[PDB]
Amino acid sequence: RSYKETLAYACRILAMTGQEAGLAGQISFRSERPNAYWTLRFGLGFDEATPDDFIEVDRDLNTLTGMANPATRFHLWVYDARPDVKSLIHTHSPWASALAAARQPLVIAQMDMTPLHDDCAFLGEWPGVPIADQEGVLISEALGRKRAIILAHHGYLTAGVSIEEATYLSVYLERAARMQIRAQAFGPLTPVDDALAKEAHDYLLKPSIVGATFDYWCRQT
Amino acid sequence: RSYKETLAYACRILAMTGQEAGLAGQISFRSERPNAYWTLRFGLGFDEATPDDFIEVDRDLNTLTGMANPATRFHLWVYDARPDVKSLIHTHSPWASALAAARQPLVIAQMDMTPLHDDCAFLGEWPGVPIADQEGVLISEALGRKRAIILAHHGYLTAGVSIEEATYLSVYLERAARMQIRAQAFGPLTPVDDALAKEAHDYLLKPSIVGATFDYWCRQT
Amino acid sequence: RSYKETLAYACRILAMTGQEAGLAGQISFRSERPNAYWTLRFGLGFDEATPDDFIEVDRDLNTLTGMANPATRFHLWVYDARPDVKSLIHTHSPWASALAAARQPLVIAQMDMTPLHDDCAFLGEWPGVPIADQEGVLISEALGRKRAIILAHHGYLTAGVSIEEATYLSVYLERAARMQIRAQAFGPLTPVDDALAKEAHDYLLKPSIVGATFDYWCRQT
Amino acid sequence: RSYKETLAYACRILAMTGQEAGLAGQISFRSERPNAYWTLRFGLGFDEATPDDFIEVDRDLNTLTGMANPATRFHLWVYDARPDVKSLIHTHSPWASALAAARQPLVIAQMDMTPLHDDCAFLGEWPGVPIADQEGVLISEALGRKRAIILAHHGYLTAGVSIEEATYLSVYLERAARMQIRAQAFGPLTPVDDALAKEAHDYLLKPSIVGATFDYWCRQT
Ligand code: NI
Ligand code: NI
Ligand code: NI
Ligand code: NI
Question: B194 near B186, Cβ under 8 Å?
């Protein structure tokens, strides 16, 4: 499977799991060329993405292979800060945006939430509509070494070492948000023990489990 | 794209996003002739609307081109009060009606809610089943210059300068209501800063963003 | 449209609007012969109902035209107490059952809830699994002259003067329950004024509005 | 109907009712050979299960008929402790996992919840990612003679005397969790009387009702 069809599959999986709110959905894949990234072109939604819809652009959004969503220009900043990351996803999914609107960080209280235990930062500042510089610097510093970040009053972003892991973390974060919001009906949520959480975090992020789960999602589109 | 197929597309987008509760859904488009508007004929739902289902009627609901939903007669009153508005949508969508049933105005707490920041009025009075005169005057005075209004114990109405902007505001209001209701689980909601909210309000209501998002929704029907 | 296809259409509308929880769904239509009713045969769900699946049975569940769901035997008791009623629906729909599980009567707080204003009784007693005699007598006395009743720890039942009105009330009750439950997030719900509620109750239950809305739902199946 | 197609049908019913969260879904059927069980092979989701996808494995996960999901190895432990049980289901369904994340046992407050009255244990300890020995022993001791168990911070498991009853209990538990969570909006939930609950528990778990409801679900896939 080439990276262009893996990118298109990830977009279908994101829409299949209900992670699209207009054209806010963004996905990128680190290009072999420095200061460049592969992303979805402007005006296209997640579930209508084909391999021929992802284009390579540079730091100035010059489509150097194959017009990209200009709100993805900040992706190069976090790519710069994290060489281990090859793919990024940022959407305004319903449950994750509700958590972000209430300024609520994730509370790891169930097994499927552990992939984000000690791996989901929280950026309390909502900068409005900043330039790619301010937005890119703000998220990079707040993301740190973590695999995901909840952006208050905004949504989330996932930083995966592959398109598969970024999609994996993206689907699990949104369902983690739904789970946390529903469990809130019984009052404040008690988190699980950190030692077991990290243990479950490591088991659920295994490349064999991540790869097989992604393949399962592909066959569903 | 002609206005008749844009009207039919808007109805499909409204039903696609779950904004129909029986035959309560109403949509209108200002006619070139004064004291006349284009609307959907009686008995038809949103997702079964075709370009040949929208008819022109006057102040007395006389179908002067192509029987209209008589509960849309009040649309001419707000058209009279706002010459900048060319399209109107009024539905009893599930999340917006729940917000209206609880007498709850919108609290702008997330980025996708900003299109309604300082642009969503609240009519606390529910007049029951008034004549088109009383209902038209009540909503016009309460709507003011705003792009939308929550009608307590009823639903909402959007006033757009085009069918595309009315549909745009309609979809974002309903998902704003869903977001606010879900975020309420954590207690009262803290709104975002007004200066950034207006800034995000202006960016998200850009005609290029509104037009592209509408096109994306059309390709989905 | 014959009554056999109207019964089958009502079942599809009930399943279309998500009102099935296993084989608990029951629908009946008063037969021309006394002490007899038309109902759906045992083992069939709502969305697989055809006109040839409704059979006439008597007080002893003897299929005298065309084996019926024996839990519908109590329908004859309420038919006896209300000669104006020709159709009955009883389901364990998700939102209405949640309201019944919490022993919560309907609070009319939105326009689409008015068809049940002063028309939805509440039976606080859950009798378990009673015989058709006890269950039939208990519901008849508690239903009174009302068009619907919430059965605590159970579900609801609608009593319509036609299959169309029973389906109409059934769909609006379930969405009334969903609306009330969601609006509860903001605290206790303030009901609308009774005078306007009865006025809206009378407008929304007009046979022309009920008939047109039913036709719209049929074209959707 | 052979047991291989009954197993495949159960998986489709589980996915039809929304009981899949990645590849966490597990189903097993006791084999005629001791210390062996029939389960779904690794990497496959519930709704893509065919009769030719279930394989027989022993205590060491050696596929002795037809590679199985190794997280199902603990199924043999509970099979050992309960000879009356022939089928087991363990999923991380959304509503049941939210209940488990909040450490909330089921409160029987509605008729369709009674199949689990005095039949749903609660394991407060979440062991993380234990070996099949620890996980198998922990669940067996906590399950006892009950037909289901809520696993805190995890999900649930159902122990049925057939694939049909395990699927039956599985679907009703998840909808019981959804019902309880939604009813929580009105405050703490008052449970029904135990005598009637056990009576309704016995009526709803009748093999004729369980078998007919399973057949209805099969015709829906
Ligand atoms: Ni964004
Ligand atoms: Ni209205
Ligand atoms: Ni019942
Ligand atoms: Ni598990």
Answer: no
